[PDB]
Amino acid sequence: RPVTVLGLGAMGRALAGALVAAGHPTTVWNRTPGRAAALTAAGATEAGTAAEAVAAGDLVVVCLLDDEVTRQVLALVAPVLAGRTLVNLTNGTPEQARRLAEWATSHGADHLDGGIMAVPAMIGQPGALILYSGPEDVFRAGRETLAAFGAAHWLGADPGAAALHDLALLAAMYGMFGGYLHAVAMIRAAGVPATGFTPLATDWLTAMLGALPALARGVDSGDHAADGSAVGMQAAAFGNLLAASREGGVSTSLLEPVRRLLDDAVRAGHGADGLSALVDLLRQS
Amino acid sequence: RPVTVLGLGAMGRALAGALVAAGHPTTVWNRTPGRAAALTAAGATEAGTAAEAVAAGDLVVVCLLDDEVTRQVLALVAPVLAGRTLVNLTNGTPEQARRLAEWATSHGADHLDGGIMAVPAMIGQPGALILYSGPEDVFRAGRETLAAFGAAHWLGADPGAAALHDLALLAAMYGMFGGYLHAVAMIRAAGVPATGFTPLATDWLTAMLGALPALARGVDSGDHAADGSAVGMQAAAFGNLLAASREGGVSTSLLEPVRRLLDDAVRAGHGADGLSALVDLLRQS
Ligand SMILES: NC(=O)c1ccc[n+]([C@@H]2O[C@H](COP(=O)([O-])OP(=O)(O)OC[C@H]3O[C@@H](n4cnc5c(N)ncnc54)[C@H](OP(=O)(O)O)[C@@H]3O)[C@@H](O)[C@H]2O)c1
Numbered sequence: 215r216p217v218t219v220l221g222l223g224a225m226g227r228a229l230a231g232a233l234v235a236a237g238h239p240t241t242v243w244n245r246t247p248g249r250a251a252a253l254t255a256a257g258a259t260e261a262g263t264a265a266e267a268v269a270a271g272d273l274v275v276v277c278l279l280d281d282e283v284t285r286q287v288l289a290l291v292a293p294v295l296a297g298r299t300l301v302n303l304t305n306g307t308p309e310q311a312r313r314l315a316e317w318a319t320s321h322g323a324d325h326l327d328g329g330i331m332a333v334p335a336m337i338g339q340p341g342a343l344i345l346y347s348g349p350e351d352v353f354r355a356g357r358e359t360l361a362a363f364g365a366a367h368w369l370g371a372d373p374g375a376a377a378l379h380d381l382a383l384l385a386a387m388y389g390m391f392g393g394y395l396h397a398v399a400m401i402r403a404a405g406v407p408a409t410g411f412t413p414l415a416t417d418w419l420t421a422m423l424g425a426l427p428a429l430a431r432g433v434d435s436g437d438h439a440a441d442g443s444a445v446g447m448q449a450a451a452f453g454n455l456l457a458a459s460r461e462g463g464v465s466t467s468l469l470e471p472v473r474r475l476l477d478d479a480v481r482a483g484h485g486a487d488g489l490s491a492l493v494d495l496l497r498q499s
Numbered sequence: 500r501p502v503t504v505l506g507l508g509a510m511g512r513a514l515a516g517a518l519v520a521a522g523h524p525t526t527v528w529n530r531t532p533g534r535a536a537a538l539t540a541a542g543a544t545e546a547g548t549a550a551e552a553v554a555a556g557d558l559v560v561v562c563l564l565d566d567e568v569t570r571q572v573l574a575l576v577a578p579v580l581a582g583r584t585l586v587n588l589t590n591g592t593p594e595q596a597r598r599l600a601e602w603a604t605s606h607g608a609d610h611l612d613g614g615i616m617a618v619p620a621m622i623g624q625p626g627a628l629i630l631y632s633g634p635e636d637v638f639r640a641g642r643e644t645l646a647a648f649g650a651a652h653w654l655g656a657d658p659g660a661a662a663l664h665d666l667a668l669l670a671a672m673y674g675m676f677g678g679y680l681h682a683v684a685m686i687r688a689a690g691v692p693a694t695g696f697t698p699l700a701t702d703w704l705t706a707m708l709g710a711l712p713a714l715a716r717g718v719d720s721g722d723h724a725a726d727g728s729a730v731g732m733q734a735a736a737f738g739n740l741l742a743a744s745r746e747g748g749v750s751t752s753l754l755e756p757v758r759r760l761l762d763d764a765v766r767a768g769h770g771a772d773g774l775s776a777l778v779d780l781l782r783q784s
Pocket residue numbers: 221222223224225226227244245246247249277278279280283287303304305306330331332333334727728729732736
């Protein structure tokens with residue numbers, strides 16, 4: 215398939231470069247000129263307009279700054295989208311992806327949302343993960359092209375499924391990193407190097423990953439059975455963590471929300487339950 | 500060695516039970532009577548006073564509610580601590596452990612601080628982890644007794660080292676769990692079960708654990724080189740996570756501190772650096 219990339223920022227250039235290096239006939243476009251020098255040198259074709267670029271591709275890959283820019287560029291190319299497949303690799307929300315699917319359908323185009331789980335430099339390597347959602351046959355017809363970026367993981371027909379899982383994985387990653395970064399700040403304040411702490415932390419967190427299936431079972435079942443590590447005891451043990459942080463001059467900012475959630479769970483009567491009881495406490499609607 | 504346990508709450512009873520089942524001559528004490536029925540039935544001896552219990556053991560294991568209770572009980576038994584080794588398995592802070600080491604030395608006793616990384620039910624199984632710190636020979640003379648509880652990991656001569664690493668590991672665990680719990684709340688609000696999400700999350704977080712060595716290298720070196728995933732882009736991508744959470748009626752409480760830290764890092768000029776630059780931003784002293 216001939217392919218088109220709209221957007222030549224850091225990620226867009228990596229995307230186009232992976233397509234070129236795989237042999238796909240690739241046409242690229244970007245608002246600001248001078249971003250396709252190496253791409254054109256390697257075999258790509260730089261269109262002068264987005265509509266031109268779109269007309270030269272059966273599969274249109276979009277990677278712009280945000281969903282608002284995306285919707286603006288696409289509105290300009292709406293008359294030419296008919297019969298093509300739109301693959302939005304711009305980051306966005308699940309609802310924005312579902313709205314784009316309906317809008318694309320209104321202009322005769324297929325649609326897939328994508329959430330890139332890798333850095334630009336990893337694009338094109340088999341370990342690079344990109345999540346996709348949308349109609350299964352649309353993914354099927356395009357997956358060999360998407361494989362140029364790395365692994366292509368179809369999550370389901372819901373157009374918003376890729377963005378949902380992308381952002382949820384990011385939430386899990388930022389939680390883990392925030393806890394690790396607080397931990398290293400505590401040991402740094404005591405003069406202990408972070409390099410020697412990493413094996414202990416990795417072994418520990420690897421062990422903690424084994425607690426996830428039981429947590430998920432409790433969430434889905436509503437049976438918040440404890441694995442001996444109950445909310446009430448964990449709430450009682452958090453205070454030493456806060457005090458030791460203050461002892462070392464380390465801010466408690468990263469830890470306060472978990473403390474409050476634990477205290478709120480105890481107030482709600484969940485002291486004898488496991489952490490699966492914490493999930494529905496995050497509901498605000 | 501004859502051993503003594505002070506404190507028969509959930510953890511203290513598990514500790515004493517592991518000692519009994521290993522064959523150690525065990526003497527136990529507790530403030531409230533009636534907590535040693537099964538222990539005495541299995542071969543333990545219940546002393547009527549803490550001082551009695553202490554006098555019947557060369558190694559005194561303490562597991563009370565908190566450091567304030569610990570210091571009160573011990574003050575009463577100070578005249579009889581001479582020549583014994585004190586192993587405090589009550590949770591506490593690094594400074595409290597260092598102060599107890601000095602106080603114990605003042606009464607002719609050796610001292611080890613311990614931080615229990617396992618649940619009461621796992622005490623006695625080889626996978627149960629307890630961290631220890633204090634003089635290396637004191638640990639050596641006692642480690643075969645400590646092995647009744649599970650693995651005994653000596654972290655160094657600093658009496659506060661076990662509590663420091665214990666609490667740092669807890670910070671990493673609570674960060675990871677908070678991120679996971681937010682993630683499952685997002686997918687739950689979309690009607691997706693947590694059970695099917697767990698493999699993706701475990702694979703993802705296992706991959707993320709591979710980023711730790713580079714982070715630790717940057718912290719120790721002060722060279723906050725980016726792995727392509729720079730602070731500025733991660734700050735720009737966090738907003739979609741917040742918006743998607745609001746879309747699903749999910750509180751953003753667990754995520755706000757990481758957002759603020761990222762924004763603060765950008766303000767401080769670290770937008771092109773990796774997350775290792777975030778550590779020294781947590782300093783308040
Ligand atoms: N890079 C990563 O590490 C990473 C990881 C995962 C996913 N992503 C996602 O990839 C997407 C792009 O990131 P990036 O690294 O490529 O960012 P970037 O380097 O800042 O590039 C932004 C792109 O948007 C274009 N653009 C901005 N405003 C525009 C407008 N008004 N009209 C038309 N085009 C406009 C820019 O074109 P000009 O050259 O004309 O400014 C440029 O091509 C984002 O949605 C991001 O979340 C990135």
